[PDB]
């Protein structure tokens, strides 16, 4: 059901752009600017793989289900699990 | 309720001419309620929800 | 480029204020409802004043038309005849009275410009002529002509029509036939629309605001007769089955302050009736 | 007696047999024999198709 | 103005209280003159707006 | 739709006619304000 | 771009629930900060599924709040949507956006929760089509379809009942004719007690929003056509309706048995609210209304007793005025009273199990949640027996 999914994903207020990065590392199905975030999400796929190894090898009983990236300029409130990492850059206010 | 306790007593002279002002107070209350009924009936049933 | 203008004409409601509500308003009590816009005339929209004006009835709306129709307005005055279908007896009357309005309107303020004969009549003999090609035979039009394109609003009541007086398709064929005949006589194309339904108006109106449209008659309810698809063969097939052969009587088929008394008068009357 | 006549006329306002009379008479004269169809609860009704 | 129109139907209710002779004639013809009053105030108001 | 007896009321045509004319009068001066 | 293979990979079976998690947690993450006693608790309303929904009953959430089925009688306001509206909401996040949409293919009328299930929801319709939903996942299709023959119902299911425990999973579905059918809560094929509410007079009992005794008691009190408190049992020597204690008028739109005992006795009492423009007190030894409450202006529709303070009810009316009364404290006046938006004719009232807050339902959509922070832990058994004695001394002359 891509209707309710994309609906509640991009329809959410201030959501600039989500990145549904799969194992492939390419956000072809997302609401970010694909020609700019394709390589971004691929590089971040490798480094988030580094982060998965870190968080899951030092403390193996700690998964990664929600990454509230509180930056100085954007609310990248990523929504992960063991399957994806919804890297979503969202408007702060 | 107080009037309801001794409705029939409102005949005897000591009870006839001694409560009339309080009686008029409740008459005003009754009149207000009758007017509220007028306001309610003017809002008829099919016009209402 | 330059701006445009649209003159919409309607009768007994039938979807006029709502029609312009569905173009892309406070109330409706004195006609002339202005409509400023930004029209995409094939390339961009730079806040082009394609002013549309709402007009219904006959009780002195020429002042409104004066603020609406002008000298340099007529070449693209995409006039719209609006008539519903719920009360066809009032619809036949509506299109007839509005036809009289447009004829006397052309014969009222459109006749003094002399260049419009060999200019506007040529535009008519081009307009209704180029109407049948570039879309989708002998469109018998009247003596009149202006950018006529009839769009019948309030057509989302076919079920209400068969629920009231149709129960078959006689009122969906005879009425379609003769009104399509009237519209082809006006030099227009019979278009139907409803409340957010029958999307076929942006094609031709955007085609003349200076993206084609097909044509079928199997529908018979949401009757789409686009540019030049109007003739008298399909309508002959429509107003013949189950009705009389070319009828004119089907139209007729679908078609306490007491007193007070006196005193001296009543007293003398009482003495009179004393007996 | 003032409020008495007030409540009396307002009680007379409740005499609203317009829609009531319309509903009763229309229901009687319309459904006087409407439920007389005892054929079945499955009938035939189609058009030319 | 609308408040006094409500008072006009209030007077209609006052006429519904008891028996009259030309009650709809009285109301409706005064309403015709009210429409003439509306003509005076309407031309003044429309010219004002 | 009314459960009363004021059938001889003011008018069944007056009330919203004034507001309709006032509405178009407001539409002109407000929508063509730009 | 071209993503059909990714529609199967990305938008797979288990990944749709994960996408529901992503949408839910980010839409909940919307409450992000900067990255440098009448109180009216809450109110909820969907502008797409709750819009103009003329309803008479829903499925509240006393136990486990912040998720309550708004099983709306789907009006024709949205004909281009699935005909049936059931909306659980999120009071914990306080949102009204159409996230937890739920729908059927008929007029959803009082789709209560199923027995032993928070996800499975049971519900009758206008034609007695009881449907069901097992939302273990985030699904919405009514997975069950009740047969609608002669023994079944074709009239609105007023108030379906859940009787028993894990052994006896009984369901009492009733039509307007009063045909009771005790469908088992596992199979929708045979209703166990599929009989008629036979009473002393008019066996075809025109039931109207009956009520269910506290304590798994079968001595139900059916609200009916003109008050008509039908007191009976479903089985035993009086399987049909034994009697009708009445004195209330009109179709009962609200009736409720004993509340949750604070410090009182069992208090075998109940109350009724209907077209008599009021509520009337009752018990098990009356046969007449124990105490007819104030006949307010308009149809008093619902009424409900509070669990914190058992001796206090709440009732709205035809002019939307909630009046919660504790006659052991506020006798002639209600304990708290507040109107709704305007003065409409509402239909539901339901106390929160936590008490000191209540979720009241309007009969056209929006649901208000008022707050009343007054009661504390107090032994109201004394005031209970004393006020019962006062009424017992007032009725005499």
> Is G93's Cβ below 8 Å from some Cβ in A?
no
Which G residues, 27 through 66, put their C-beta within 8 Å of a C-beta on chain A? 27, 29-30, 32, 34-36
> Which domain, by its residues, includes C123?
1-255
C208-238: b (≥16 Cβ within 10 Å) or e: bbeeebebebeebbebbbbbbbbbeebbeeb
Cα B44 from Cα B42, distance rounded (Å): 5
C16-22 long-range CB contacts below 8 Å, 24 or more apart? C16/C54, C16/C56, C16/C82, C16/C153, C17/C54, C18/C153, C18/C154, C18/C195, C19/C80, C19/C82, C19/C151, C19/C153, C19/C193, C20/C52, C20/C54, C22/C193, C22/C195, C22/C196
Indicate yes or no: CB of D13 within 8 angstroms of CB of E18. no
As given in the structure block, the two tokens for residue G219 are 């001595």
The position carrying tokens 């499955």 is: D42
In angstroms, the CA C75 to CA C4 distance is: 10
CA G79 from chain center: how many Å?
Answer: 26
Please state, in angstroms and rounded to a whole number, the distance separating the CA atoms of residues G283 and G291.
10
Q: Are G279 and G271 in contact (CB under 8 A)?
A: yes
Is G25 an interface residue toward A (CB < 8 Å)? yes
Which residue in chain D has the smallest CA separation from F2? D19
Distance of CA G122 to CAs C48, C86, G147, G151, G223, Å?
57, 43, 15, 19, 21
- Between CA C28 and CA B43, with CA E5 as vertex, the angle to 5 degrees is 95
CA distance C161 to C172: 9
* Structure tokens given for E15: 């006429």
Asked whether the beta carbons of residue G345 and residue B36 sit closer than 8 angstroms, the reply is no
Q: How far apart are CA C118 and CA C103, in angstroms?
A: 19
Q: How many CA atoms lie within 13 A of A16 on its CB side?
A: 15
C-beta separation of G374 from G37 below 8 A: yes
- Helix, strand, coil percentages (3-state) for chain B, rounded to 5, are 65, 0, 35
User: E23-48 and F15-31 helices cross at what angle (nearest 10)?
Assistant: 10
Structure method: cryo-EM
The DSSP element (H or E) to which A70 belongs, if any, is strand A67-70
Give per-residue burial for B20-45: e unless 16+ CB within 10 Å, then b. eeeeeeeeeeeeeeeeebeeebeeee
**Secondary structure (DSSP) of B8-22:** TTTTSHHHHTTSHHH
CA distance G198 to G178: 9
Distance separating alpha carbons of residues G132 and G130, to the nearest angstrom: 7
> How many domains, in total, are found in chain A?
1
Interface chains of chain B (3 or more CB pairs under 8 Å): D, F, G
In angstroms, the CA C98 to CA D17 distance is 44
Residues forming beta bridges with residue C82, ordered by sequence position: C10
- Going by their DSSP bridges, the two strands G303-305 and G313-315 should be labelled as antiparallel
User: What chain E residue is nearest to D13 in terms of C-alpha separation?
Assistant: E17
In this structure, is residue C263 part of a structural domain?
Answer: no
Number of Cβ within a 10 Å radius of residue E24? 17
Q: What single-letter DSSP state applies at residue G131?
A: E
Q: What are phi and psi of G182, to 5 degrees?
A: -90, 85
Q: Do E21 and C261 touch (CB under 8 A)?
A: yes
Domain count, chain C: 1
Interchain contact A13–G (C-beta under 8 A): yes
Q: Please state the separation of Cα E4 from the chain's center in Å.
A: 8
Give the gap in angstroms from C-alpha B2 to the nearest C-alpha of chain D. Answer: 22
Contact assessment for residue G173 and residue G160, using Cβ atoms and an 8 Å cutoff: yes
- Check which CATH number belongs to the domain holding A69 and give it: 3.30.450.30
Q: How many CA atoms lie within 13 A of G346 on its CB side?
A: 29
**Contact residues, A window 61-80, toward G, CB-based 8 Å cutoff:** 65-66, 68, 70-75, 77, 79
| Pair type for strands C80-82 and C5-10 | parallel
For residue C107, being part of any structural domain is answered with yes
Q: Do chains G and B touch (3 or more CB pairs under 8 A)?
A: yes
Chain D interface disruption, residue of B23, B26, B34, most D CBs within 10 A: B34
Q: Do F9 and E27 touch (CB under 8 A)?
A: yes
Q: Does B5 touch chain D (CB under 8 A)?
A: no
Please spell the DSSP secondary structure of C77-137, one letter per residue. --BEEE--SSSHHHHHHHHHHHHHHHHHHIIIIISS-THHIIIIIHHHHHHTTSSSSS---
Distance from CA of D49 to the nearest CA of B (A): 43
| C28 vs F18, F23, F32: nearest CB | F23
**Strand, coil or helix: G343:** coil
Edge-first strand order for the sheet with G303-305 is G303-305, G313-315, G321-325, G336-339
Both tokens assigned to G49:
């599924």
Contacts of E9 in chain F (CB under 8 A): 6, 9-10
Strand bridging mode G336-339 / G243-245: unpaired
Chain B residue closest in CA terms to D7: B34
* Of C273, C255, C256, the residue nearest C87 (C-alpha): C255
CB contact under 8 A, B34 and D14: no
User: Count of CB atoms within 10 A of residue G383's CB?
Assistant: 16
DSSP chain C: ----EEEEEESSSSSSHHHHHT------SSS-B--------SS--S----EEEEEESSSS-HHHHHHH--GGGGGG--BEEE--SSSHHHHHHHHHHHHHHHHHHIIIIISS-THHIIIIIHHHHHHTTSSSSS--------S--SSB--EE-----HHHHHHHT-SSSSTTTHHHHHHHHHHHHTT---EE-BTTB---HHHHHHHS---------S-SSS----TT---SSHHHHHTTTTS-SS-SSHHHHH--------SHHHHHHHHHTT-
Residues from chain F that touch B47, judged by Cβ atoms under 8 A, are: 1-3
What's the CA gap between C204 and C185, in Å, rounded? 19
d(CA G249, CA G292): 11
Interface test with B, best of D13, D22, D23 (most B CBs within 10 A): D13
- Helices C88-105, C174-185: axis angle to 10 degrees equals 0
Q: Which of B32, B48, B47 is nearest to G298 (CA)?
A: B48
B33 touches chain G (CB under 8 A): no
Contacts of G344 in chain B (CB under 8 A): 49
Residues 6+ apart with CB under 8 A from A17: A30, A31, A32, A33, A37, A88, A89
Determine which helix (DSSP H) or strand (DSSP E) holds D18, and give its type and residue range: helix D17-30
Q: Evaluate whether residue C268 is within a structural domain.
A: no
d(CA C85, CA C64): 27
CA distance G301 to G364: 14
Interface test mutation site (partner E, options D2, D6, D9, max chain E beta carbons within 10 A)? D9
> How buried is residue E36: exposed, middle or buried, by Cβ count under 10 Å (0-12/13-18/19+)?
exposed
Asked if residues G79 and G52 have their Cβ atoms less than 8 Å apart, the reply is: no
Residue C272 in any domain: the answer is no
Q: Nearest Cα to G308, choosing from G359, G376, G387?
A: G376
Burial of C260 (0-12, 13-18, 19+ CB in 10 A): exposed
Question: What is the distance of C-alpha G9 from the center of its chain?
Answer: 42
Distance between terminal CA atoms of chain D?
A: 74
Determine the Cα–Cα distance for residues C187 and C140; give it in Å rounded to an integer: 8
Minimum-distance CB partner of E49 among F5, F6, F25: F25
Q: What dihedral do alpha carbons G170, G176, G178, G182 form, nearest 10°?
A: -10
Match 């408040």 to its residue by tokens: E3
Count of CB atoms within 10 A of residue E49's CB? 11
For residue A13, the enclosing domain spans: 1-93
Strand partners, G324: G314, G336
Looking at the DSSP bridge assignments, the partners of residue G274 are G278
3-state secondary structure of G204: coil
Task: Check C30 against F21: CB less than 8 A apart.
Answer: yes
Q: Cβ separation of F17 and C29 shorter than 8 Å?
A: yes
Q: Give the number of residues written for chain B.
A: 49
CA distance G240 to chain B (A): 36
User: Of G316, G230, G319, nearest to G270 (Cα)?
Assistant: G230
Chains contacting E (3+ CB pairs below 8 angstroms): C, D, F
């Amino acid at each position: 059901e891509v209707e309710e999914t994309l609906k509640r994903l991009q329809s959410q207020k201030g959501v600039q752009g989500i990145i549904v990065v799969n194992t492939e590392g390419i956000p072809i199905k997302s609401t970010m600017d694909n020609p700019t975030t394709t390589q971004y999400a691929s590089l971040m796929h490798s480094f988030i793989l580094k982060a998965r190894s870190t968080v899951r090898d030092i403390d193996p009983q700690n998964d990664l289900t929600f990454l509230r990236i509180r930056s100085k300029k954007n609310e990248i409130m990523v929504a992960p699990d063991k399957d994806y990492f919804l890297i979503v850059i969202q408007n702060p206010t | 309720r107080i009037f309801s306790r001794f409705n029939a007593l409102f005949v005897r002279p000591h009870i006839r001419g001694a409560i009339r002002e309080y009686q008029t107070q409740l008459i005003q209350r009754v009149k207000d309620d009758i007017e509220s009924l007028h306001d309610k009936f003017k809002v008829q049933y099919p016009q209402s929800q | 480029p330059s701006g445009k203008n649209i003159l919409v004409f309607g009768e007994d409601g039938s979807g006029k204020t709502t029609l312009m509500t569905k173009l892309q308003h406070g109330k409706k009590g004195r006609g002339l409802e202005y409509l400023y816009l930004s029209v995409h005339d094939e390339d961009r929209d730079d806040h082009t004043r394609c002013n549309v004006w709402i007009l219904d009835g006959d009780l002195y709306h020429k002042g409104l038309l004066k603020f609406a129709v002008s000298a340099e307005s007529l070449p693209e005055t995409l006039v719209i005849f609006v008539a519903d279908m719920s009360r066809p007896w009032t619809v036949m009357e509506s299109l007839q009275k509005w036809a009289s309005v447009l004829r006397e309107h052309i014969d009222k303020m459109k006749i003094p410009p002399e260049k419009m004969r060999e200019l506007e009549r040529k535009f008519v003999k081009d307009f209704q002529d180029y109407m049948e090609p570039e879309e989708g035979d002998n469109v018998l039009t009247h003596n009149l002509g202006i950018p006529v394109l009839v769009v019948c609003t309030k057509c989302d009541a076919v079920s209400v029509l068969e629920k009231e007086h149709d129960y078959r398709d006689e009122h969906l064929d005879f009425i379609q036939s003769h009104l399509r005949r009237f519209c082809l006589q006006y030099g227009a194309a019979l278009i139907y629309t409803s409340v957010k339904e029958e999307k076929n108006l942006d094609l031709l109106y955007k085609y003349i605001v200076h993206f084609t449209t097909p044509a079928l008659v199997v529908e018979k309810d949401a009757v789409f007769i686009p540019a030049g698809w109007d003739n008298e063969k399909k309508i002959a097939i429509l107003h013949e089955n189950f009705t009389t052969v070319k009828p004119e009587d089907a139209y007729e088929d679908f078609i306490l302050a007491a007193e007070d008394e006196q005193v001296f008068l009543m007293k003398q009357q009482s003495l009179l009736a004393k007996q | 007696q003032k409020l008495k006549q007030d409540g009396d006329s307002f009680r007379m306002k409740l005499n609203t047999q317009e829609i009531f009379d319309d509903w009763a008479r229309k229901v009687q004269q319309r459904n006087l024999g409407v439920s007389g169809r005892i054929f079945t609860i499955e009938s035939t009704r189609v058009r030319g198709r | 103005f609308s408040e006094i129109l409500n008072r006009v139907q209030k007077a209609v209710d006052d006429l519904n209280l008891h028996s009259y002779s030309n009650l709809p004639i009285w109301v409706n013809k005064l309403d015709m003159e009210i429409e003439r009053i509306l003509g005076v105030r309407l031309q003044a108001g429309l010219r004002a707006w | 739709r009314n459960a009363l007896t004021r059938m001889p009321d003011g008018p069944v045509a007056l009330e919203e006619s004034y507001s309709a004319v006032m509405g178009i009068v407001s539409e002109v001066e407000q929508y063509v304000k730009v | 771009l071209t993503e059909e293979e990714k529609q199967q990979i990305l938008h797979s079976e288990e990944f749709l629930s994960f996408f529901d998690h992503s949408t839910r947690i980010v839409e909940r993450a919307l409450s992000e900060q900067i990255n440098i006693k009448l109180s009216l608790n809450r109110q909820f309303f969907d502008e797409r599924w709750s819009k103009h929904r003329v309803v008479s009953c829903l499925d509240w959430s006393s136990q486990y709040p912040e998720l309550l089925v708004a099983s709306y009688n789907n009006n024709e306001d949205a004909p281009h949507e699935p005909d049936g509206v059931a909306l659980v909401w999120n009071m914990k996040y306080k949102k009204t956006t159409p996230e937890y949409v739920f729908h059927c293919q008929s007029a959803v009328m009082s789709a209560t929760f199923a027995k032993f299930h928070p996800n499975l929801v049971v519900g009758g319709t206008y034609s007695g089509q009881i449907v069901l939903w097992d939302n273990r996942s985030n699904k919405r299709t009514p997975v069950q379809r009740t047969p609608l023959s002669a023994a079944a119902h074709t009239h609105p299911v007023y108030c379906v009942n859940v009787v028993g425990t894990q052994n006896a999973h009984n369901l009492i579905s009733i039509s307007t004719d009063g045909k009771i059918c005790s469908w088992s809560l596992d199979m929708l094929s045979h209703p166990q007690d599929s009989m008629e509410l036979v009473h002393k007079q008019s066996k075809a009992v025109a039931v109207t929003s009956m009520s269910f005794p506290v304590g798994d008691v079968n001595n139900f009190v059916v609200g009916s056509e003109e008050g008509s408190v039908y007191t009976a049992c479903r089985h035993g020597s009086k399987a049909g309706i034994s009697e009708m204690f009445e004195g209330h008028q009109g179709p009962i739109t609200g009736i409720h048995c004993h509340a949750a005992v604070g410090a009182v006795d069992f208090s075998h009492l109940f109350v009724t609210s209907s077209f008599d423009w009021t509520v009337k007190l009752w018990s098990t030894k009356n046969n007449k209304p124990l105490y007819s409450f104030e006949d307010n202006a308009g149809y008093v529709y619902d009424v409900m007793w509070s669990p914190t303070h058992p001796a206090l009810f709440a009732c709205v009316d035809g002019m939307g005025r909630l009046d919660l009364w504790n006659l052991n404290n506020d006798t002639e006046v209600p304990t708290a009273s507040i109107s709704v938006e305007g003065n409409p004719a509402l239909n539901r009232v339901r106390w929160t199990h936590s008490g000191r807050e209540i979720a009241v339902g309007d009969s056209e959509g929006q649901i208000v949640i008022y707050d009343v922070g007054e009661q504390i832990a107090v032994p109201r058994n004394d005031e209970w027996a004393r006020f019962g004695r006062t009424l017992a001394e007032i009725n005499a002359n």
